Amino acid sequence: GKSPTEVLLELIAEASGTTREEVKEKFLKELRKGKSPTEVLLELIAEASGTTKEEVKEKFLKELSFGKSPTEVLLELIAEASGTTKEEVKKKFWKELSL
Ligand code: NA
Ligand code: NA
Numbered sequence: 001g002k003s004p005t006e007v008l009l010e011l012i013a014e015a016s017g018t019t020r021e022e023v024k025e026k027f028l029k030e031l032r033k034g035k036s037p038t039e040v041l042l043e044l045i046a047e048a049s050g051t052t053k054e055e056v057k058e059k060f061l062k063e064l065s066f067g068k069s070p071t072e073v074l075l076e077l078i079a080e081a082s083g084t085t086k087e088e089v090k091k092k093f094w095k096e097l098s099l
Pocket of ligand 2: 038
């Protein structure tokens with residue numbers, strides 16, 4: 001998938017055991033309710049890990065407060081959700097972006 005968002009949604013699908021289109025459609029529908037893309041990604045990640053959305057959102061925000069970058073944090077959260085390494089998820093991200 002071309003864009004960074006599309007690649008994140010693909011990674012979330014893999015972590016969720018759902019299709020890329022299913023995740024995309026959930027993402028689009030939530031945006032239509034007036035949510036922001038970052039907020040929606042965090043909810044999707046929470047769903048994928050079986051964790052509450054508030055817990056995932058607070059972790060994100062705390063990491064940002066430490067001076068981490070948003071995409072980096074999202075990747076780390078996706079890695080937590082799939083039980084894979086941060087390094088493995090980041091590799092996939094850059095690979096998929098690359099094509
Ligand atoms: Na499925
Ligand atoms: Na983003």
